Amino acid sequence: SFQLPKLSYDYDELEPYIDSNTLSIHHGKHHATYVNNLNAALENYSELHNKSLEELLCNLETLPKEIVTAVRNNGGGHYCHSLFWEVMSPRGGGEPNGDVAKVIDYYFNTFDNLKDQLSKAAISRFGSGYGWLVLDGEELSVMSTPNQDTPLQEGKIPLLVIDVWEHAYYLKYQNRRPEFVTNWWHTVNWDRVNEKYLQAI
Amino acid sequence: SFQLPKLSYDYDELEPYIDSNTLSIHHGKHHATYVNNLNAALENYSELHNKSLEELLCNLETLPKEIVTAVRNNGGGHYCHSLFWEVMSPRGGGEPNGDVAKVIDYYFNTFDNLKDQLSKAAISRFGSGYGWLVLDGEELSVMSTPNQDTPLQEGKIPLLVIDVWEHAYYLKYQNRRPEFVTNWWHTVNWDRVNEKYLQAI
Ligand SMILES: [Mn+2]
Ligand SMILES: [Mn+2]
């Protein structure tokens, strides 16, 4: 039922920021595996077949105990990676544009300050996880999550995410997570972020 | 003044099971960083300068709140990597020997069954962490931990450990964690596992 989304670009089109082999494995093995495991967990619970990915991740307590973890982990993996691919682009980078640029300045004063704060949140996530920009009411804030956990469980709406699982960066950057994060800003699709923000409100 | 331990073997000596680049970075960068951050956290707390690593990690609940996470994470990293290196060897692999082989048969029926159980525990540890063989009273058992957490916390004594942080295996095995686990078995220093068992009594 859940499907692996096609990327908007080819596996070599985020070079040199993200290497081609990594993008192909990260999408075609890691993300594909979360989708397949999510579908396996839900196969035999047809009462859940019409839940959207968001509904599942917003209501994890109410699932059968046999599958809550599988849905948390693989549903999370599906959600997080799907957003990650959407917010990068072969012609991204630079400063925010559109309506969201304005709300960014409102809450962070400058874009450079947002970049500093999200970068710190991502680098400071110990072990596997993500850094996030979220809408919490009218407010923009930065946070991190462990593993494939998401902000939806907390009522916050993701606009932008960076994957700091070691698989996201180890082939090119090895232990140098901060160098990966510095490079990742060059890929950011501010057009798509602005679309996510409008959707959110 | 914790120190990075010397390996018992050169960086190319676990080939072809673990690549030399990985071994060099994993010991010389990752493990070194945990040691350096551990020493940095303890520097301002003179009370603690004579506590052993085992003491620190068995009594986290009592450290200053300003540094407990730093000690858990970096003390953990030094403990876990220090054991990881001593349980592998260029002479390792195969079926267990010595007294521990008899205790393995006693609790698992056969060694092949221990191997299945520990491999499963390592593979199923979602995110970053470790798989362990521990002594829990007189009884030996298999478990996993997240991040740089150890069984000491819980009163159990480590005899053997596998690192399943992605940094342990990504350069050679990428997403194929099961393949990495299969190869790691060819490295196991059963002499050292035996010594750790005898001491655990
Ligand atoms: Mn990922
Ligand atoms: Mn490690």
Side-chain angles (χ1 to χ4, degrees), chain A residues 25-67:
Chain A
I25 298 165
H26 199 175
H27 176 260
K29 302 284 178 183
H30 286 279
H31 189 183
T33 290
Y34 292 128
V35 173
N36 294 333
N37 292 351
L38 173 58
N39 288 328
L42 292 166
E43 260 156 1
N44 293 314
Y45 302 80
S46 58
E47 79 272 13
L48 303 176
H49 289 355
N50 285 315
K51 302 299 200 206
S52 69
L53 186 55
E54 293 63 35
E55 278 165 327
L56 263 12
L57 294 179
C58 285
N59 303 99
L60 291 162
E61 342 75 71
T62 71
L63 298 174
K65 289 313 195 200
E66 328 86 78
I67 69 177

mmCIF file of all heavy atoms in Angstrom, chain A residues 25-67:
data_model
loop_
_atom_site.group_PDB
_atom_site.id
_atom_site.type_symbol
_atom_site.label_atom_id
_atom_site.label_comp_id
_atom_site.label_asym_id
_atom_site.label_seq_id
_atom_site.Cartn_x
_atom_site.Cartn_y
_atom_site.Cartn_z
ATOM 1 N N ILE A 25 21.956 4.379 -2.496
ATOM 2 C CA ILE A 25 21.730 3.437 -1.396
ATOM 3 C C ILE A 25 20.716 3.995 -0.375
ATOM 4 O O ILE A 25 19.804 3.271 0.065
ATOM 5 C CB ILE A 25 23.050 3.086 -0.638
ATOM 6 C CG1 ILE A 25 24.052 2.409 -1.585
ATOM 7 C CG2 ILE A 25 22.714 2.148 0.543
ATOM 8 C CD1 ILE A 25 25.438 2.355 -1.076
ATOM 9 N N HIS A 26 20.883 5.271 -0.006
ATOM 10 C CA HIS A 26 20.026 5.916 0.994
ATOM 11 C C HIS A 26 18.537 5.870 0.552
ATOM 12 O O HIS A 26 17.642 5.533 1.326
ATOM 13 C CB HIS A 26 20.524 7.331 1.232
ATOM 14 C CG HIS A 26 20.051 7.952 2.515
ATOM 15 N ND1 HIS A 26 20.480 9.187 2.930
ATOM 16 C CD2 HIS A 26 19.180 7.512 3.468
ATOM 17 C CE1 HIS A 26 19.926 9.465 4.106
ATOM 18 N NE2 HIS A 26 19.141 8.457 4.470
ATOM 19 N N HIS A 27 18.288 6.165 -0.724
ATOM 20 C CA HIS A 27 16.910 6.077 -1.291
ATOM 21 C C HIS A 27 16.511 4.625 -1.621
ATOM 22 O O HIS A 27 15.476 4.144 -1.176
ATOM 23 C CB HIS A 27 16.800 6.990 -2.509
ATOM 24 C CG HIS A 27 15.482 6.910 -3.230
ATOM 25 N ND1 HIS A 27 15.317 6.162 -4.377
ATOM 26 C CD2 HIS A 27 14.284 7.489 -2.983
ATOM 27 C CE1 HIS A 27 14.069 6.276 -4.800
ATOM 28 N NE2 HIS A 27 13.418 7.076 -3.975
ATOM 29 N N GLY A 28 17.328 3.925 -2.399
ATOM 30 C CA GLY A 28 16.917 2.639 -2.972
ATOM 31 C C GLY A 28 17.112 1.419 -2.084
ATOM 32 O O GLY A 28 16.605 0.337 -2.392
ATOM 33 N N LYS A 29 17.873 1.568 -0.995
ATOM 34 C CA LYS A 29 17.986 0.493 -0.024
ATOM 35 C C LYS A 29 17.362 0.897 1.320
ATOM 36 O O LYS A 29 16.465 0.211 1.798
ATOM 37 C CB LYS A 29 19.447 0.044 0.151
ATOM 38 C CG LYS A 29 20.119 -0.443 -1.165
ATOM 39 C CD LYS A 29 19.626 -1.800 -1.507
ATOM 40 C CE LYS A 29 20.200 -2.353 -2.834
ATOM 41 N NZ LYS A 29 19.553 -3.689 -3.083
ATOM 42 N N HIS A 30 17.808 2.001 1.922
ATOM 43 C CA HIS A 30 17.354 2.354 3.293
ATOM 44 C C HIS A 30 15.848 2.698 3.277
ATOM 45 O O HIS A 30 15.039 2.111 4.022
ATOM 46 C CB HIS A 30 18.202 3.484 3.921
ATOM 47 C CG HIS A 30 19.574 3.064 4.376
ATOM 48 N ND1 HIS A 30 19.797 2.428 5.576
ATOM 49 C CD2 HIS A 30 20.799 3.235 3.814
ATOM 50 C CE1 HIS A 30 21.093 2.192 5.716
ATOM 51 N NE2 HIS A 30 21.725 2.680 4.665
ATOM 52 N N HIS A 31 15.472 3.642 2.418
ATOM 53 C CA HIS A 31 14.082 4.105 2.383
ATOM 54 C C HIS A 31 13.181 2.992 1.874
ATOM 55 O O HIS A 31 12.152 2.734 2.462
ATOM 56 C CB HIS A 31 13.960 5.397 1.591
ATOM 57 C CG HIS A 31 12.607 6.062 1.674
ATOM 58 N ND1 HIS A 31 12.304 7.212 0.968
ATOM 59 C CD2 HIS A 31 11.482 5.725 2.344
ATOM 60 C CE1 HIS A 31 11.053 7.563 1.226
ATOM 61 N NE2 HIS A 31 10.535 6.678 2.064
ATOM 62 N N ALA A 32 13.609 2.289 0.834
ATOM 63 C CA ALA A 32 12.851 1.155 0.324
ATOM 64 C C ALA A 32 12.557 0.119 1.433
ATOM 65 O O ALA A 32 11.457 -0.450 1.514
ATOM 66 C CB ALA A 32 13.622 0.518 -0.812
ATOM 67 N N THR A 33 13.542 -0.107 2.287
ATOM 68 C CA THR A 33 13.401 -1.072 3.402
ATOM 69 C C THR A 33 12.377 -0.658 4.466
ATOM 70 O O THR A 33 11.599 -1.511 4.950
ATOM 71 C CB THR A 33 14.777 -1.382 4.031
ATOM 72 O OG1 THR A 33 15.550 -2.163 3.097
ATOM 73 C CG2 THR A 33 14.624 -2.141 5.341
ATOM 74 N N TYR A 34 12.365 0.621 4.838
ATOM 75 C CA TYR A 34 11.318 1.172 5.709
ATOM 76 C C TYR A 34 9.915 0.998 5.109
ATOM 77 O O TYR A 34 8.983 0.611 5.797
ATOM 78 C CB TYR A 34 11.604 2.654 5.990
ATOM 79 C CG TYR A 34 12.859 2.833 6.850
ATOM 80 C CD1 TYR A 34 13.868 3.687 6.467
ATOM 81 C CD2 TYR A 34 13.017 2.140 8.060
ATOM 82 C CE1 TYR A 34 15.044 3.853 7.274
ATOM 83 C CE2 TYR A 34 14.154 2.317 8.857
ATOM 84 C CZ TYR A 34 15.164 3.157 8.452
ATOM 85 O OH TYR A 34 16.296 3.342 9.245
ATOM 86 N N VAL A 35 9.771 1.291 3.821
ATOM 87 C CA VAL A 35 8.466 1.090 3.186
ATOM 88 C C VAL A 35 8.016 -0.384 3.216
ATOM 89 O O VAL A 35 6.866 -0.696 3.543
ATOM 90 C CB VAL A 35 8.446 1.628 1.721
ATOM 91 C CG1 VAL A 35 7.125 1.232 1.050
ATOM 92 C CG2 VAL A 35 8.612 3.130 1.712
ATOM 93 N N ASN A 36 8.905 -1.291 2.868
ATOM 94 C CA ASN A 36 8.562 -2.701 2.806
ATOM 95 C C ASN A 36 8.227 -3.239 4.199
ATOM 96 O O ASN A 36 7.259 -3.986 4.388
ATOM 97 C CB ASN A 36 9.717 -3.508 2.180
ATOM 98 C CG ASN A 36 9.966 -3.169 0.710
ATOM 99 O OD1 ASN A 36 9.072 -2.744 -0.027
ATOM 100 N ND2 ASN A 36 11.183 -3.409 0.273
ATOM 101 N N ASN A 37 9.013 -2.863 5.195
ATOM 102 C CA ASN A 37 8.746 -3.296 6.572
ATOM 103 C C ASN A 37 7.461 -2.709 7.172
ATOM 104 O O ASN A 37 6.754 -3.402 7.938
ATOM 105 C CB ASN A 37 9.969 -3.001 7.449
ATOM 106 C CG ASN A 37 11.154 -3.876 7.087
ATOM 107 O OD1 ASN A 37 11.024 -4.810 6.298
ATOM 108 N ND2 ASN A 37 12.301 -3.601 7.672
ATOM 109 N N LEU A 38 7.143 -1.464 6.789
ATOM 110 C CA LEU A 38 5.891 -0.796 7.197
ATOM 111 C C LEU A 38 4.708 -1.577 6.654
ATOM 112 O O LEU A 38 3.808 -1.957 7.423
ATOM 113 C CB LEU A 38 5.868 0.674 6.719
ATOM 114 C CG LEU A 38 4.590 1.486 6.910
ATOM 115 C CD1 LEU A 38 4.240 1.495 8.432
ATOM 116 C CD2 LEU A 38 4.740 2.865 6.330
ATOM 117 N N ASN A 39 4.724 -1.826 5.340
ATOM 118 C CA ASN A 39 3.702 -2.656 4.672
ATOM 119 C C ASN A 39 3.586 -4.085 5.261
ATOM 120 O O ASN A 39 2.479 -4.577 5.481
ATOM 121 C CB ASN A 39 3.948 -2.698 3.142
ATOM 122 C CG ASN A 39 3.625 -1.377 2.451
ATOM 123 O OD1 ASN A 39 2.714 -0.644 2.879
ATOM 124 N ND2 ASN A 39 4.317 -1.099 1.345
ATOM 125 N N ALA A 40 4.710 -4.719 5.591
ATOM 126 C CA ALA A 40 4.668 -6.037 6.287
ATOM 127 C C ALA A 40 3.993 -5.985 7.648
ATOM 128 O O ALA A 40 3.227 -6.880 7.981
ATOM 129 C CB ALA A 40 6.054 -6.652 6.438
ATOM 130 N N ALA A 41 4.305 -4.972 8.451
ATOM 131 C CA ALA A 41 3.693 -4.787 9.766
ATOM 132 C C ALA A 41 2.149 -4.663 9.680
ATOM 133 O O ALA A 41 1.418 -5.218 10.514
ATOM 134 C CB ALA A 41 4.289 -3.561 10.450
ATOM 135 N N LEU A 42 1.669 -3.984 8.640
ATOM 136 C CA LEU A 42 0.256 -3.650 8.503
ATOM 137 C C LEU A 42 -0.568 -4.653 7.678
ATOM 138 O O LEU A 42 -1.802 -4.611 7.712
ATOM 139 C CB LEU A 42 0.124 -2.269 7.885
ATOM 140 C CG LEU A 42 0.590 -1.075 8.729
ATOM 141 C CD1 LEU A 42 0.696 0.097 7.804
ATOM 142 C CD2 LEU A 42 -0.341 -0.764 9.878
ATOM 143 N N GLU A 43 0.111 -5.526 6.936
ATOM 144 C CA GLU A 43 -0.525 -6.544 6.068
ATOM 145 C C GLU A 43 -1.855 -7.073 6.615
ATOM 146 O O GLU A 43 -2.880 -7.049 5.936
ATOM 147 C CB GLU A 43 0.403 -7.776 5.938
ATOM 148 C CG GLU A 43 1.234 -7.897 4.672
ATOM 149 C CD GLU A 43 2.508 -8.757 4.864
ATOM 150 O OE1 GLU A 43 2.738 -9.286 5.982
ATOM 151 O OE2 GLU A 43 3.316 -8.867 3.900
ATOM 152 N N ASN A 44 -1.791 -7.584 7.841
ATOM 153 C CA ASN A 44 -2.845 -8.402 8.408
ATOM 154 C C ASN A 44 -3.739 -7.637 9.399
ATOM 155 O O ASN A 44 -4.492 -8.247 10.166
ATOM 156 C CB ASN A 44 -2.217 -9.623 9.081
ATOM 157 C CG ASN A 44 -1.571 -10.567 8.088
ATOM 158 O OD1 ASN A 44 -2.152 -10.886 7.052
ATOM 159 N ND2 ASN A 44 -0.369 -11.022 8.401
ATOM 160 N N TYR A 45 -3.660 -6.308 9.369
ATOM 161 C CA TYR A 45 -4.502 -5.449 10.211
ATOM 162 C C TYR A 45 -5.287 -4.522 9.291
ATOM 163 O O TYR A 45 -4.998 -3.331 9.179
ATOM 164 C CB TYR A 45 -3.659 -4.635 11.215
ATOM 165 C CG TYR A 45 -2.794 -5.447 12.168
ATOM 166 C CD1 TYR A 45 -1.572 -5.971 11.765
ATOM 167 C CD2 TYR A 45 -3.206 -5.684 13.468
ATOM 168 C CE1 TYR A 45 -0.788 -6.721 12.650
ATOM 169 C CE2 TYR A 45 -2.440 -6.406 14.339
ATOM 170 C CZ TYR A 45 -1.227 -6.923 13.936
ATOM 171 O OH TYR A 45 -0.480 -7.648 14.840
ATOM 172 N N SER A 46 -6.302 -5.075 8.624
ATOM 173 C CA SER A 46 -7.026 -4.325 7.606
ATOM 174 C C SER A 46 -7.841 -3.163 8.169
ATOM 175 O O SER A 46 -8.227 -2.285 7.411
ATOM 176 C CB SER A 46 -7.931 -5.246 6.801
ATOM 177 O OG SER A 46 -8.822 -5.890 7.672
ATOM 178 N N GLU A 47 -8.088 -3.156 9.483
ATOM 179 C CA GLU A 47 -8.695 -1.999 10.149
ATOM 180 C C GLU A 47 -7.828 -0.733 10.097
ATOM 181 O O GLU A 47 -8.330 0.365 10.383
ATOM 182 C CB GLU A 47 -9.090 -2.312 11.614
ATOM 183 C CG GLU A 47 -7.960 -2.295 12.690
ATOM 184 C CD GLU A 47 -7.245 -3.647 12.867
ATOM 185 O OE1 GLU A 47 -7.426 -4.559 12.011
ATOM 186 O OE2 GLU A 47 -6.500 -3.794 13.876
ATOM 187 N N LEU A 48 -6.552 -0.873 9.706
ATOM 188 C CA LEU A 48 -5.622 0.265 9.642
ATOM 189 C C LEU A 48 -5.269 0.677 8.211
ATOM 190 O O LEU A 48 -4.508 1.640 7.999
ATOM 191 C CB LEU A 48 -4.327 -0.100 10.385
ATOM 192 C CG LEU A 48 -4.465 -0.514 11.858
ATOM 193 C CD1 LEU A 48 -3.137 -0.944 12.426
ATOM 194 C CD2 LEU A 48 -5.035 0.656 12.661
ATOM 195 N N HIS A 49 -5.831 -0.014 7.220
ATOM 196 C CA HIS A 49 -5.378 0.168 5.845
ATOM 197 C C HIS A 49 -5.716 1.525 5.238
ATOM 198 O O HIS A 49 -5.111 1.909 4.244
ATOM 199 C CB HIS A 49 -5.873 -0.949 4.915
ATOM 200 C CG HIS A 49 -5.214 -2.278 5.143
ATOM 201 N ND1 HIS A 49 -4.173 -2.462 6.030
ATOM 202 C CD2 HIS A 49 -5.429 -3.482 4.563
ATOM 203 C CE1 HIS A 49 -3.798 -3.729 6.004
ATOM 204 N NE2 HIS A 49 -4.542 -4.369 5.119
ATOM 205 N N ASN A 50 -6.642 2.268 5.826
ATOM 206 C CA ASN A 50 -6.992 3.585 5.282
ATOM 207 C C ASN A 50 -6.392 4.759 6.074
ATOM 208 O O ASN A 50 -6.616 5.915 5.725
ATOM 209 C CB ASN A 50 -8.504 3.729 5.196
ATOM 210 C CG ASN A 50 -9.107 2.933 4.044
ATOM 211 O OD1 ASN A 50 -8.602 2.949 2.914
ATOM 212 N ND2 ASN A 50 -10.213 2.246 4.325
ATOM 213 N N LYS A 51 -5.626 4.454 7.125
ATOM 214 C CA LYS A 51 -4.937 5.496 7.897
ATOM 215 C C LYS A 51 -3.844 6.095 7.029
ATOM 216 O O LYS A 51 -3.118 5.380 6.338
ATOM 217 C CB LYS A 51 -4.289 4.935 9.175
ATOM 218 C CG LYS A 51 -5.211 4.238 10.155
ATOM 219 C CD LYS A 51 -6.279 5.173 10.671
ATOM 220 C CE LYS A 51 -6.899 4.708 11.972
ATOM 221 N NZ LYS A 51 -8.290 5.233 12.130
ATOM 222 N N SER A 52 -3.712 7.406 7.078
ATOM 223 C CA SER A 52 -2.616 8.057 6.409
ATOM 224 C C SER A 52 -1.361 7.909 7.280
ATOM 225 O O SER A 52 -1.411 7.560 8.463
ATOM 226 C CB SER A 52 -2.908 9.531 6.164
ATOM 227 O OG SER A 52 -2.932 10.243 7.377
ATOM 228 N N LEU A 53 -0.228 8.167 6.679
ATOM 229 C CA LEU A 53 1.027 8.070 7.415
ATOM 230 C C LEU A 53 1.024 8.981 8.678
ATOM 231 O O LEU A 53 1.423 8.566 9.770
ATOM 232 C CB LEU A 53 2.166 8.446 6.479
ATOM 233 C CG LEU A 53 3.579 8.279 7.003
ATOM 234 C CD1 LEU A 53 3.832 6.862 7.492
ATOM 235 C CD2 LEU A 53 4.502 8.650 5.867
ATOM 236 N N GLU A 54 0.538 10.208 8.517
ATOM 237 C CA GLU A 54 0.377 11.145 9.634
ATOM 238 C C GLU A 54 -0.513 10.615 10.736
ATOM 239 O O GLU A 54 -0.172 10.770 11.896
ATOM 240 C CB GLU A 54 -0.171 12.487 9.143
ATOM 241 C CG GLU A 54 0.803 13.268 8.247
ATOM 242 C CD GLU A 54 1.142 12.556 6.939
ATOM 243 O OE1 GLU A 54 0.249 11.861 6.341
ATOM 244 O OE2 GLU A 54 2.324 12.685 6.509
ATOM 245 N N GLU A 55 -1.643 9.984 10.391
ATOM 246 C CA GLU A 55 -2.573 9.470 11.408
ATOM 247 C C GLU A 55 -1.897 8.385 12.242
ATOM 248 O O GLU A 55 -2.017 8.351 13.474
ATOM 249 C CB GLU A 55 -3.878 8.934 10.771
ATOM 250 C CG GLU A 55 -4.916 9.999 10.440
ATOM 251 C CD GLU A 55 -6.032 9.513 9.486
ATOM 252 O OE1 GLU A 55 -5.767 8.668 8.599
ATOM 253 O OE2 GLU A 55 -7.185 10.008 9.619
ATOM 254 N N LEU A 56 -1.184 7.493 11.565
ATOM 255 C CA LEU A 56 -0.443 6.438 12.248
ATOM 256 C C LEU A 56 0.518 7.077 13.255
ATOM 257 O O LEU A 56 0.513 6.708 14.446
ATOM 258 C CB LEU A 56 0.335 5.571 11.244
ATOM 259 C CG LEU A 56 -0.187 4.224 10.697
ATOM 260 C CD1 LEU A 56 -1.622 3.916 10.981
ATOM 261 C CD2 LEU A 56 0.163 4.066 9.206
ATOM 262 N N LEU A 57 1.305 8.041 12.791
ATOM 263 C CA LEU A 57 2.397 8.609 13.617
ATOM 264 C C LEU A 57 1.885 9.546 14.726
ATOM 265 O O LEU A 57 2.558 9.748 15.737
ATOM 266 C CB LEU A 57 3.420 9.311 12.712
ATOM 267 C CG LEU A 57 4.168 8.343 11.775
ATOM 268 C CD1 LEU A 57 5.170 9.122 10.881
ATOM 269 C CD2 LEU A 57 4.888 7.222 12.545
ATOM 270 N N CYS A 58 0.674 10.072 14.542
ATOM 271 C CA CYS A 58 -0.005 10.875 15.565
ATOM 272 C C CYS A 58 -0.733 10.073 16.646
ATOM 273 O O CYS A 58 -1.130 10.661 17.663
ATOM 274 C CB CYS A 58 -1.003 11.815 14.895
ATOM 275 S SG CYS A 58 -0.174 13.198 14.086
ATOM 276 N N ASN A 59 -0.913 8.760 16.439
ATOM 277 C CA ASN A 59 -1.764 7.919 17.295
ATOM 278 C C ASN A 59 -1.130 6.563 17.644
ATOM 279 O O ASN A 59 -1.810 5.533 17.668
ATOM 280 C CB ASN A 59 -3.143 7.725 16.626
ATOM 281 C CG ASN A 59 -3.855 9.071 16.329
ATOM 282 O OD1 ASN A 59 -3.831 9.586 15.191
ATOM 283 N ND2 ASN A 59 -4.462 9.649 17.361
ATOM 284 N N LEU A 60 0.173 6.569 17.937
ATOM 285 C CA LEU A 60 0.924 5.320 18.072
ATOM 286 C C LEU A 60 0.470 4.445 19.229
ATOM 287 O O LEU A 60 0.534 3.233 19.136
ATOM 288 C CB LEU A 60 2.461 5.577 18.146
ATOM 289 C CG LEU A 60 3.129 6.078 16.849
ATOM 290 C CD1 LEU A 60 4.493 6.709 17.117
ATOM 291 C CD2 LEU A 60 3.216 4.954 15.803
ATOM 292 N N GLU A 61 -0.003 5.059 20.311
ATOM 293 C CA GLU A 61 -0.506 4.315 21.502
ATOM 294 C C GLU A 61 -1.688 3.414 21.204
ATOM 295 O O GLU A 61 -1.924 2.443 21.929
ATOM 296 C CB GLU A 61 -1.006 5.234 22.631
ATOM 297 C CG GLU A 61 -0.562 6.649 22.585
ATOM 298 C CD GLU A 61 -1.274 7.505 21.530
ATOM 299 O OE1 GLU A 61 -2.483 7.833 21.678
ATOM 300 O OE2 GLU A 61 -0.580 7.870 20.559
ATOM 301 N N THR A 62 -2.472 3.768 20.194
ATOM 302 C CA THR A 62 -3.732 3.083 19.963
ATOM 303 C C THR A 62 -3.564 1.858 19.065
ATOM 304 O O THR A 62 -4.526 1.114 18.836
ATOM 305 C CB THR A 62 -4.742 4.042 19.332
ATOM 306 O OG1 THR A 62 -4.352 4.299 17.988
ATOM 307 C CG2 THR A 62 -4.769 5.355 20.093
ATOM 308 N N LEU A 63 -2.348 1.643 18.558
ATOM 309 C CA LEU A 63 -2.053 0.492 17.699
ATOM 310 C C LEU A 63 -1.911 -0.749 18.547
ATOM 311 O O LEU A 63 -1.532 -0.655 19.713
ATOM 312 C CB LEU A 63 -0.762 0.717 16.895
ATOM 313 C CG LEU A 63 -0.777 1.905 15.926
ATOM 314 C CD1 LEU A 63 0.599 2.136 15.288
ATOM 315 C CD2 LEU A 63 -1.832 1.671 14.843
ATOM 316 N N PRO A 64 -2.210 -1.920 17.971
ATOM 317 C CA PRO A 64 -1.874 -3.217 18.567
ATOM 318 C C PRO A 64 -0.401 -3.285 19.032
ATOM 319 O O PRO A 64 0.505 -2.859 18.290
ATOM 320 C CB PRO A 64 -2.124 -4.183 17.413
ATOM 321 C CG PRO A 64 -3.175 -3.547 16.617
ATOM 322 C CD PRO A 64 -2.923 -2.079 16.687
ATOM 323 N N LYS A 65 -0.164 -3.780 20.252
ATOM 324 C CA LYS A 65 1.204 -3.807 20.803
ATOM 325 C C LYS A 65 2.201 -4.616 19.996
ATOM 326 O O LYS A 65 3.382 -4.297 19.974
ATOM 327 C CB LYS A 65 1.190 -4.326 22.247
ATOM 328 C CG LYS A 65 0.577 -3.341 23.231
ATOM 329 C CD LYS A 65 1.143 -1.922 23.037
ATOM 330 C CE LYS A 65 0.851 -1.014 24.198
ATOM 331 N NZ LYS A 65 0.973 0.385 23.754
ATOM 332 N N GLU A 66 1.736 -5.679 19.358
ATOM 333 C CA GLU A 66 2.565 -6.472 18.456
ATOM 334 C C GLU A 66 3.213 -5.622 17.366
ATOM 335 O O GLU A 66 4.236 -6.040 16.836
ATOM 336 C CB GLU A 66 1.773 -7.574 17.703
ATOM 337 C CG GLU A 66 0.635 -8.173 18.402
ATOM 338 C CD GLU A 66 -0.630 -7.380 18.226
ATOM 339 O OE1 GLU A 66 -1.278 -7.479 17.137
ATOM 340 O OE2 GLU A 66 -0.968 -6.675 19.199
ATOM 341 N N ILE A 67 2.606 -4.487 16.988
ATOM 342 C CA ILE A 67 3.134 -3.709 15.822
ATOM 343 C C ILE A 67 3.504 -2.236 16.047
ATOM 344 O O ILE A 67 4.026 -1.577 15.136
ATOM 345 C CB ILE A 67 2.166 -3.760 14.602
ATOM 346 C CG1 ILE A 67 0.885 -2.980 14.903
ATOM 347 C CG2 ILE A 67 1.936 -5.221 14.148
ATOM 348 C CD1 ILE A 67 -0.084 -2.929 13.741
#
